[PDB]
């Protein structure tokens, strides 16, 4: 199969279950919403080695937010609902309560799990807390130096998906990166998904375990490394390919991960010099969710 | 004392000792160096509940970096040296090694303390690592999907200073915030200092204890909360002030913190409506370093 | 009427007829599309002394463009169609054809007036030009140093509207500006409208003619100048207002100008410190279109 | 000659004399200074068909500006001083006087030619204008909606140089463009130079005259068009090069243009896949100036 002359390999991405909380952050302007959302979701590329897996889902319009202010939806992800609450508390308390002009609202109002993060945050006000109602929502006011920090009582969390992905093979590093850049921008327009790696993009890649250093949990997949492809006789890097980037995608449900993969791939293949689109998996042996590339189109 | 008509309080900032590692992240472009530096220094506003205290010190010119490429100096800070090496490993490994086009060099090369982060990261290549020399510096090549990730053997660290600061009182929220924004942009031009809070800016503030919820080691200082200044009879907030922002400054030495406080204050008072500059201290009974505002000028 | 506690003055904006060409600029990434769109719509705040009035209407998703690439819709506006065609030729030929990775498409394909800029631009190729179809659209290929510049044959123009507007009265300059910024960002999300002033925002304001220098086409309206409100008997600036910003909106039809005004106003009034919303007209006897604020809600 | 393994052609850039005016635009923050600087220097890639050649020379620190505020130095260029004064009045009057929070100061205070743009702009105030002194400079206050617009009396100008340049040959479009991006960010650090094309970068290129359409002053140089290199017996495009980008540099003197050419090339050649650096000239038979590439190093 080819889109724009670019081979889409008949394979699938293997994705795992993960606990995902959705938080709406509003602020005085877009810039300040984005500043807080970025800080809150930093140091969160992969939960296998980071405190969490987090990122920006989409920009929120003034027309859809409880307070009518510009905002940013973020997702924060961990394996356990407990470590998720701990992350919501450390990240929202230390990076959003402390950020200029922010309010936090529940991104998953209908979720069965509801961590009472707004409630727990109010105590920082040390007696000066207030309770008010924004658009039918139970919100605590927390007087701080800037004014009132507004936090809705609960943050919703569900079981979603981590590790939907696709690989971009390019003739040069900057060809592949530009494809990846165009893919992440498109996915950042879509609801339900995040791309937790730096700028949304995996530069490294990974195989489970190791060949030489068996103590390590994960290592570079030598078969996807362009610079050593002539030493690696089962290499996935052709002679006309000099770089691969991967886009890792997390999301609330299967259909939102698929929409992100489809849109991202179609954006990626618009860059001249892209040689192949593929995806990473583990055989069917680990991940429950399997996104077949060909079924997207 | 007034600067530009703005009252400068005759007080001082109270700063604590901290461990600081300086890292240079280079990348293909300014934009990719900033993506990596930001991801790597997020979720790190305060070591008192974040994994670290971190931020961007200043942009690196292509004319000054080991590889002649655009870069960003970051500082990652922590109380104990053991925790720092750990934070360096996790933040550079998960947020820079994985980020597009990045190389990591030692920000504090002549420093006495050195963490061998590059040596430790090379193991990711699983036998495929190499060793090269960039501008006299010892560097490890780690083959990954995009190409080769370059990481200098060591990252230096020193005994630095956290918690230098000044307060900005404004007639309105956006007056005080714009003043803070101008101060943060100014400080980001300066070598040796960072401003670890979201956007460099503290919206919250805090006192050392609690009047009510004694199970909290720190709460909002109600004396600097404008939205409740009428029900707080020992309020530090004038009737014509509606918002206060604080800029916290970590740095390598005392001279750099002072340069940052001075430049930041001088930029802040250029914003019309700013009423007063102050600073936060703990009676002199908590931190070794005293930065007196009037001695800056 | 009050929205969010801010007085909406019972008045109207007086808008004029103007010719508007709509152009879609696609590029390799959002960033490059924005670079070209920004260069091409610069020096174009008011046709009363600029070669045109022009701006960014809104970003284009890869999912909606003819080539599947990210894009930006811009509007270029003049009083006469003939001046519009020169501006299209000069602005596109010199700021888009020369800009990295761009393609131009017709933003008003179903319009009666069609300036064949694509045809005219093909002659830069000097014999080496070609023809194609992108998405059922007729496109000329112009070989240049970067690759092939693609330009659809025609660019559609209509009789649109210039000078929908509202004024934001704030307690400080940064209160009023932040309100304006939030409004411009909201309007930049909306189809059909641009905001041609720098950053979308009018800091100056004007009245027709003069009191003193009668040889001038326009001068500052002393009535809306806060810094001299005490030396002007007929001042429109309340004692509690220290700054006003205006947002000018050009647009394709009345529906889209009303939507922009409504949306921009609802965003502006979310900033604490905003005292009044108003609009500027000329007494009903210079403008063809009158948009009354109270009708918006 | 090679730098970082990239062949530098023994050729020269051919540059022409041009009038250059230097202007300092300050504002409340970097962002607002950049907005105004950008609007004022847009639609100004080439004096050939644009009303001017203009661009951002470099950002100004709060520590170096007359008012202590962040700023941006811009250059605006025409062939005759007659056209220049018109462009200063029109670009500054329409794009800077109208822009949020800006003030303007003379960027060339010692130049012999001094255009009295501030004097002329003050008439906008219609009798309400006044005179003040900022850091020893004669400045006019023009009351407007936002507050007071401050404009220094004169803007200096000199006979400078337009059309210093170099070409970047890449293996792919995005390789060449990333090298050009890196080059332009570097030159934006340097005093005395601008890069007037969109985002600093020339995607088109040109030869004097035409092979076919002789009614044209300039056409695409088919010898540097990679798209059709197999159709042009005369091609300067190697088989392994797929895209060329040019950086055009205007500047105050030869030395500052040389420095930008040098720093630009040294940044360009850090991007993997760059094949060759060159420059554009006109046989030596059109321009007073000739910058030899090999003589830069």
């Amino acid at each position: 199969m080819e889109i724009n002359g670019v081979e889409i390999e008949d394979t699938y991405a293997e994705a795992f279950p993960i606990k995902i909380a959705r938080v709406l952050i509003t602020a005085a302007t877009k810039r300040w919403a984005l500043v807080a959302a970025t800080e809150a979701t930093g140091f969160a590329t992969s939960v296998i080695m980071c405190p969490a897996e987090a990122g920006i889902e989409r920009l929120a319009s003034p027309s859809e937010t409880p307070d009518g202010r510009p905002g940013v939806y973020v997702q924060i992800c961990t394996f356990k609902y407990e470590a998720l609450e701990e992350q919501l508390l450390e990240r929202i308390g230390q990076c959003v309560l402390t950020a200029p002009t922010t309010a936090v609202f529940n991104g998953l109002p209908e979720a069965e799990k509801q961590d009472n993060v707004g409630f727990k945050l109010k105590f920082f006000a040390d007696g000066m807390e207030s309770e008010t109602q924004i658009a039918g929502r139970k919100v605590y006011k927390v007087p701080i130096m800037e004014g009132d920090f507004l936090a809705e009582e609960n943050i919703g969390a569900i079981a979603g998906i981590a590790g939907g992905n696709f690989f971009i093979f390019g003739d040069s590093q900057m060809t592949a990166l530009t494809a990846a850049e165009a893919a992440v921008d498109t996915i950042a327009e879509l609801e339900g998904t995040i791309t937790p790696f730096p700028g949304g993009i995996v530069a490294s890649g990974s195989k489970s375990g190791a060949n030489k250093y068996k103590f390590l949990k994960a290592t570079a997949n030598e078969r996807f490394c362009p610079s050593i492809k002539d030493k690696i006789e089962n290499t996935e890097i052709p002679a006309d390919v000099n770089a691969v980037y991967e886009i890792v995608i997390n999301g609330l449900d299967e259909e939102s991960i698929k929409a992100a993969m489809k849109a991202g791939i179609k954006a990626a293949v618009t860059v001249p010099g892209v040689k192949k689109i593929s995806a990473g998996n583990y055989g069917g042996k680990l991940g429950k969710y399997q996104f077949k590339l060909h079924e997207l189109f």
Side-chain angles (χ1 to χ4, degrees), chain A:
Chain A
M1 181 197 273
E2 287 176 333
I3 305 165
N4 205 28
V6 181
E7 187 201 346
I8 316 302
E9 177 156 56
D10 198 333
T11 183
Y12 61 88
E14 204 176 306
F16 318 97
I18 204 165
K19 307 305 177 179
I20 298 182
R22 211 179 179 227
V23 185
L24 171 62
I25 303 165
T26 66
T29 66
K30 290 179 70 217
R31 189 239 140 139
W32 290 116
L34 180 63
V35 162
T38 298
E39 181 68 30
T41 59
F43 190 25
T45 59
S46 192
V47 78
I48 64 169
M49 314 246 345
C50 289
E53 236 156 78
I56 291 141
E57 174 187 320
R58 43 175 296 257
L59 269 35
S61 172
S63 66
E64 73 183 292
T65 54
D67 61 3
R69 294 196 309 162
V72 177
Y73 290 106
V74 296
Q75 293 177 13
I76 296 174
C77 315
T78 43
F79 284 130
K80 259 71 149 61
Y81 269 141
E82 164 220 279
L84 182 49
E85 200 200 74
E86 187 183 349
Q87 283 308 104
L88 288 176
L89 258 297
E90 298 190 8
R91 274 169 200 276
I92 301 221
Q94 296 300 119
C95 293
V96 184
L97 187 158
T98 63
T101 77
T102 61
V104 309
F105 294 97
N106 194 358
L108 285 171
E110 319 263 76
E112 270 203 72
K113 233 276 198 304
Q114 292 293 347
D115 312 91
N116 67 332
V117 184
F119 186 91
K120 288 201 183 87
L121 284 180
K122 90 195 205 100
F123 291 74
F124 180 73
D126 200 12
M128 303 315 305
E129 308 113 66
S130 333
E131 214 196 281
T132 192
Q133 176 147 283
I134 308 161
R137 287 195 203 227
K138 194 168 177 181
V139 181
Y140 296 99
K141 303 174 64 162
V142 188
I144 44 175
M145 286 201 299
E146 75 163 2
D148 294 319
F149 175 59
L150 270 44
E152 196 186 337
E153 178 182 44
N154 286 321
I155 289 165
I158 64 166
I161 310 162
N165 72 63
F166 64 96
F167 286 56
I168 304 173
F169 296 70
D171 64 1
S172 64
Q173 187 175 71
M174 297 316 317
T175 293
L177 182 49
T178 302
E181 170 170 2
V184 173
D185 280 340
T186 311
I187 293 160
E189 299 172 338
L190 304 173
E191 183 158 82
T193 47
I194 61 159
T195 53
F197 268 74
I201 301 164
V202 188
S204 57
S206 141
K207 68 172 187 288
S208 291
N211 308 312
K212 172 103 172 284
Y213 306 127
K214 265 81 122 73
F215 71 90
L216 289 165
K217 214 246 303 308
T219 49
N221 198 149
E222 65 282 347
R223 322 204 317 291
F224 294 86
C225 297
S227 68
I228 57 170
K229 71 185 174 183
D230 293 320
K231 313 182 185 300
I232 308 302
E233 249 96 334
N234 47 330
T235 185
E236 299 288 321
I237 315 306
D240 63 357
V241 170
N242 287 116
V244 186
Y245 285 97
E246 180 192 356
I247 304 312
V248 169
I249 311 167
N250 293 4
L252 303 179
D253 52 26
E254 266 170 48
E255 30 271 270
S256 68
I257 287 205
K258 288 173 181 188
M261 287 178 63
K262 187 182 177 160
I265 285 163
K266 295 223 282 190
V269 301
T270 66
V271 180
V274 173
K275 296 303 184 180
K276 177 149 75 83
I277 294 300
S278 196
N281 61 232
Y282 298 93
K285 295 296 163 188
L286 280 68
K288 163 188 171 185
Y289 306 93
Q290 298 193 158
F291 304 93
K292 291 194 216 76
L293 260 41
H294 278 31
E295 298 176 346
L296 296 171
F297 315 96

PDB file of all heavy atoms in Angstrom, chain A residues 157-179:
ATOM      1  N   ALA A 157     -10.321   9.947  35.697  1.00  0.00           N
ATOM      2  CA  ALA A 157      -9.303   9.050  35.165  1.00  0.00           C
ATOM      3  C   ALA A 157      -9.969   7.782  34.643  1.00  0.00           C
ATOM      4  O   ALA A 157     -10.956   7.317  35.210  1.00  0.00           O
ATOM      5  CB  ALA A 157      -8.294   8.704  36.248  1.00  0.00           C
ATOM      6  N   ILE A 158      -9.500   7.292  33.500  1.00  0.00           N
ATOM      7  CA  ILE A 158     -10.010   6.049  32.937  1.00  0.00           C
ATOM      8  C   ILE A 158      -8.870   5.104  32.577  1.00  0.00           C
ATOM      9  O   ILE A 158      -7.697   5.409  32.804  1.00  0.00           O
ATOM     10  CB  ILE A 158     -10.854   6.298  31.667  1.00  0.00           C
ATOM     11  CG1 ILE A 158      -9.979   6.889  30.557  1.00  0.00           C
ATOM     12  CG2 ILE A 158     -12.026   7.213  31.984  1.00  0.00           C
ATOM     13  CD1 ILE A 158     -10.624   6.853  29.197  1.00  0.00           C
ATOM     14  N   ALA A 159      -9.235   3.918  32.096  1.00  0.00           N
ATOM     15  CA  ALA A 159      -8.276   3.013  31.472  1.00  0.00           C
ATOM     16  C   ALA A 159      -8.234   3.283  29.967  1.00  0.00           C
ATOM     17  O   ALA A 159      -9.243   3.127  29.264  1.00  0.00           O
ATOM     18  CB  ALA A 159      -8.662   1.567  31.741  1.00  0.00           C
ATOM     19  N   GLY A 160      -7.113   3.850  29.524  1.00  0.00           N
ATOM     20  CA  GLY A 160      -6.910   4.114  28.112  1.00  0.00           C
ATOM     21  C   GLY A 160      -5.745   3.306  27.578  1.00  0.00           C
ATOM     22  O   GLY A 160      -5.412   2.246  28.121  1.00  0.00           O
ATOM     23  N   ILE A 161      -5.074   3.841  26.561  1.00  0.00           N
ATOM     24  CA  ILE A 161      -4.062   3.089  25.824  1.00  0.00           C
ATOM     25  C   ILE A 161      -2.752   3.862  25.683  1.00  0.00           C
ATOM     26  O   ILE A 161      -2.749   5.029  25.297  1.00  0.00           O
ATOM     27  CB  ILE A 161      -4.561   2.732  24.412  1.00  0.00           C
ATOM     28  CG1 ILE A 161      -5.943   2.090  24.486  1.00  0.00           C
ATOM     29  CG2 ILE A 161      -3.595   1.788  23.742  1.00  0.00           C
ATOM     30  CD1 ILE A 161      -6.676   2.092  23.176  1.00  0.00           C
ATOM     31  N   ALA A 162      -1.643   3.179  25.944  1.00  0.00           N
ATOM     32  CA  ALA A 162      -0.317   3.729  25.713  1.00  0.00           C
ATOM     33  C   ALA A 162       0.436   2.897  24.691  1.00  0.00           C
ATOM     34  O   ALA A 162       0.518   1.679  24.814  1.00  0.00           O
ATOM     35  CB  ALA A 162       0.463   3.762  27.007  1.00  0.00           C
ATOM     36  N   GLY A 163       1.045   3.560  23.716  1.00  0.00           N
ATOM     37  CA  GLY A 163       1.994   2.868  22.860  1.00  0.00           C
ATOM     38  C   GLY A 163       1.531   2.594  21.443  1.00  0.00           C
ATOM     39  O   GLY A 163       2.186   1.847  20.713  1.00  0.00           O
ATOM     40  N   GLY A 164       0.400   3.177  21.051  1.00  0.00           N
ATOM     41  CA  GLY A 164       0.113   3.316  19.634  1.00  0.00           C
ATOM     42  C   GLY A 164       1.254   4.092  18.992  1.00  0.00           C
ATOM     43  O   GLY A 164       1.860   4.942  19.643  1.00  0.00           O
ATOM     44  N   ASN A 165       1.637   3.733  17.771  1.00  0.00           N
ATOM     45  CA  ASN A 165       2.827   4.333  17.183  1.00  0.00           C
ATOM     46  C   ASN A 165       2.903   4.172  15.679  1.00  0.00           C
ATOM     47  O   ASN A 165       2.104   3.454  15.079  1.00  0.00           O
ATOM     48  CB  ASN A 165       4.094   3.749  17.828  1.00  0.00           C
ATOM     49  CG  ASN A 165       4.362   2.306  17.413  1.00  0.00           C
ATOM     50  OD1 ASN A 165       4.587   2.018  16.240  1.00  0.00           O
ATOM     51  ND2 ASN A 165       4.410   1.410  18.386  1.00  0.00           N
ATOM     52  N   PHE A 166       3.862   4.867  15.077  1.00  0.00           N
ATOM     53  CA  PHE A 166       4.330   4.537  13.743  1.00  0.00           C
ATOM     54  C   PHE A 166       5.732   5.082  13.514  1.00  0.00           C
ATOM     55  O   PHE A 166       6.194   5.948  14.256  1.00  0.00           O
ATOM     56  CB  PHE A 166       3.356   5.049  12.674  1.00  0.00           C
ATOM     57  CG  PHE A 166       3.221   6.542  12.621  1.00  0.00           C
ATOM     58  CD1 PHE A 166       3.967   7.287  11.708  1.00  0.00           C
ATOM     59  CD2 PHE A 166       2.261   7.192  13.389  1.00  0.00           C
ATOM     60  CE1 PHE A 166       3.752   8.655  11.554  1.00  0.00           C
ATOM     61  CE2 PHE A 166       2.037   8.557  13.246  1.00  0.00           C
ATOM     62  CZ  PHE A 166       2.783   9.289  12.324  1.00  0.00           C
ATOM     63  N   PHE A 167       6.450   4.453  12.590  1.00  0.00           N
ATOM     64  CA  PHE A 167       7.838   4.792  12.309  1.00  0.00           C
ATOM     65  C   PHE A 167       7.894   5.525  10.973  1.00  0.00           C
ATOM     66  O   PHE A 167       7.167   5.177  10.038  1.00  0.00           O
ATOM     67  CB  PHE A 167       8.693   3.522  12.223  1.00  0.00           C
ATOM     68  CG  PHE A 167       8.975   2.885  13.549  1.00  0.00           C
ATOM     69  CD1 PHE A 167       7.938   2.509  14.394  1.00  0.00           C
ATOM     70  CD2 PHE A 167      10.282   2.699  13.976  1.00  0.00           C
ATOM     71  CE1 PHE A 167       8.199   1.967  15.649  1.00  0.00           C
ATOM     72  CE2 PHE A 167      10.554   2.158  15.233  1.00  0.00           C
ATOM     73  CZ  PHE A 167       9.508   1.795  16.069  1.00  0.00           C
ATOM     74  N   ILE A 168       8.763   6.532  10.890  1.00  0.00           N
ATOM     75  CA  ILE A 168       8.951   7.315   9.671  1.00  0.00           C
ATOM     76  C   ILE A 168      10.371   7.107   9.178  1.00  0.00           C
ATOM     77  O   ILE A 168      11.325   7.478   9.863  1.00  0.00           O
ATOM     78  CB  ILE A 168       8.754   8.833   9.923  1.00  0.00           C
ATOM     79  CG1 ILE A 168       7.374   9.103  10.524  1.00  0.00           C
ATOM     80  CG2 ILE A 168       8.924   9.606   8.617  1.00  0.00           C
ATOM     81  CD1 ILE A 168       7.170  10.551  10.949  1.00  0.00           C
ATOM     82  N   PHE A 169      10.502   6.513   7.992  1.00  0.00           N
ATOM     83  CA  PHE A 169      11.806   6.287   7.361  1.00  0.00           C
ATOM     84  C   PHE A 169      12.049   7.365   6.314  1.00  0.00           C
ATOM     85  O   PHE A 169      11.229   7.555   5.411  1.00  0.00           O
ATOM     86  CB  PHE A 169      11.851   4.913   6.680  1.00  0.00           C
ATOM     87  CG  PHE A 169      11.715   3.748   7.629  1.00  0.00           C
ATOM     88  CD1 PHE A 169      10.507   3.486   8.269  1.00  0.00           C
ATOM     89  CD2 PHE A 169      12.788   2.887   7.849  1.00  0.00           C
ATOM     90  CE1 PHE A 169      10.369   2.387   9.119  1.00  0.00           C
ATOM     91  CE2 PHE A 169      12.661   1.782   8.695  1.00  0.00           C
ATOM     92  CZ  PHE A 169      11.451   1.534   9.333  1.00  0.00           C
ATOM     93  N   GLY A 170      13.171   8.071   6.437  1.00  0.00           N
ATOM     94  CA  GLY A 170      13.468   9.150   5.513  1.00  0.00           C
ATOM     95  C   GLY A 170      14.848   9.044   4.904  1.00  0.00           C
ATOM     96  O   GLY A 170      15.734   8.411   5.474  1.00  0.00           O
ATOM     97  N   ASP A 171      15.052   9.721   3.774  1.00  0.00           N
ATOM     98  CA  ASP A 171      16.350   9.716   3.102  1.00  0.00           C
ATOM     99  C   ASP A 171      17.425  10.488   3.862  1.00  0.00           C
ATOM    100  O   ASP A 171      18.614  10.239   3.683  1.00  0.00           O
ATOM    101  CB  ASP A 171      16.225  10.246   1.664  1.00  0.00           C
ATOM    102  CG  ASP A 171      15.790  11.719   1.582  1.00  0.00           C
ATOM    103  OD1 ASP A 171      15.591  12.388   2.617  1.00  0.00           O
ATOM    104  OD2 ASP A 171      15.642  12.216   0.444  1.00  0.00           O
ATOM    105  N   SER A 172      17.000  11.416   4.712  1.00  0.00           N
ATOM    106  CA  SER A 172      17.925  12.178   5.543  1.00  0.00           C
ATOM    107  C   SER A 172      17.299  12.384   6.909  1.00  0.00           C
ATOM    108  O   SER A 172      16.095  12.211   7.069  1.00  0.00           O
ATOM    109  CB  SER A 172      18.224  13.533   4.902  1.00  0.00           C
ATOM    110  OG  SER A 172      17.057  14.328   4.839  1.00  0.00           O
ATOM    111  N   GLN A 173      18.104  12.788   7.885  1.00  0.00           N
ATOM    112  CA  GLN A 173      17.589  13.036   9.228  1.00  0.00           C
ATOM    113  C   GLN A 173      16.516  14.111   9.225  1.00  0.00           C
ATOM    114  O   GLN A 173      15.474  13.962   9.862  1.00  0.00           O
ATOM    115  CB  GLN A 173      18.714  13.456  10.165  1.00  0.00           C
ATOM    116  CG  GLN A 173      18.294  13.580  11.613  1.00  0.00           C
ATOM    117  CD  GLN A 173      19.463  13.867  12.510  1.00  0.00           C
ATOM    118  OE1 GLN A 173      20.015  14.964  12.488  1.00  0.00           O
ATOM    119  NE2 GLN A 173      19.901  12.860  13.252  1.00  0.00           N
ATOM    120  N   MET A 174      16.750  15.174   8.469  1.00  0.00           N
ATOM    121  CA  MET A 174      15.838  16.307   8.495  1.00  0.00           C
ATOM    122  C   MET A 174      14.564  16.053   7.693  1.00  0.00           C
ATOM    123  O   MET A 174      13.509  16.597   8.010  1.00  0.00           O
ATOM    124  CB  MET A 174      16.550  17.575   8.022  1.00  0.00           C
ATOM    125  CG  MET A 174      17.713  18.006   8.924  1.00  0.00           C
ATOM    126  SD  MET A 174      17.402  17.939  10.727  1.00  0.00           S
ATOM    127  CE  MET A 174      15.797  18.624  10.826  1.00  0.00           C
ATOM    128  N   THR A 175      14.639  15.147   6.728  1.00  0.00           N
ATOM    129  CA  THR A 175      13.439  14.702   6.037  1.00  0.00           C
ATOM    130  C   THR A 175      12.528  13.984   7.036  1.00  0.00           C
ATOM    131  O   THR A 175      11.381  14.393   7.243  1.00  0.00           O
ATOM    132  CB  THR A 175      13.781  13.752   4.870  1.00  0.00           C
ATOM    133  OG1 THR A 175      14.487  14.470   3.854  1.00  0.00           O
ATOM    134  CG2 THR A 175      12.521  13.171   4.274  1.00  0.00           C
ATOM    135  N   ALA A 176      13.086  13.013   7.757  1.00  0.00           N
ATOM    136  CA  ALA A 176      12.289  12.211   8.683  1.00  0.00           C
ATOM    137  C   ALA A 176      11.762  13.048   9.849  1.00  0.00           C
ATOM    138  O   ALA A 176      10.621  12.891  10.266  1.00  0.00           O
ATOM    139  CB  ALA A 176      13.109  11.046   9.199  1.00  0.00           C
ATOM    140  N   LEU A 177      12.589  13.957  10.357  1.00  0.00           N
ATOM    141  CA  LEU A 177      12.198  14.799  11.480  1.00  0.00           C
ATOM    142  C   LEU A 177      11.083  15.765  11.093  1.00  0.00           C
ATOM    143  O   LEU A 177      10.153  15.985  11.860  1.00  0.00           O
ATOM    144  CB  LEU A 177      13.403  15.581  11.992  1.00  0.00           C
ATOM    145  CG  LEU A 177      13.175  16.494  13.201  1.00  0.00           C
ATOM    146  CD1 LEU A 177      12.453  15.727  14.300  1.00  0.00           C
ATOM    147  CD2 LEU A 177      14.509  17.012  13.705  1.00  0.00           C
ATOM    148  N   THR A 178      11.162  16.312   9.882  1.00  0.00           N
ATOM    149  CA  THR A 178      10.143  17.239   9.397  1.00  0.00           C
ATOM    150  C   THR A 178       8.810  16.521   9.218  1.00  0.00           C
ATOM    151  O   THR A 178       7.747  17.074   9.526  1.00  0.00           O
ATOM    152  CB  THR A 178      10.574  17.888   8.065  1.00  0.00           C
ATOM    153  OG1 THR A 178      11.820  18.567   8.264  1.00  0.00           O
ATOM    154  CG2 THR A 178       9.536  18.897   7.582  1.00  0.00           C
ATOM    155  N   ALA A 179       8.876  15.275   8.760  1.00  0.00           N
ATOM    156  CA  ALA A 179       7.687  14.436   8.652  1.00  0.00           C
ATOM    157  C   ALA A 179       7.096  14.219  10.044  1.00  0.00           C
ATOM    158  O   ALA A 179       5.891  14.361  10.249  1.00  0.00           O
ATOM    159  CB  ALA A 179       8.050  13.099   8.017  1.00  0.00           C
TER     160      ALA A 179
END
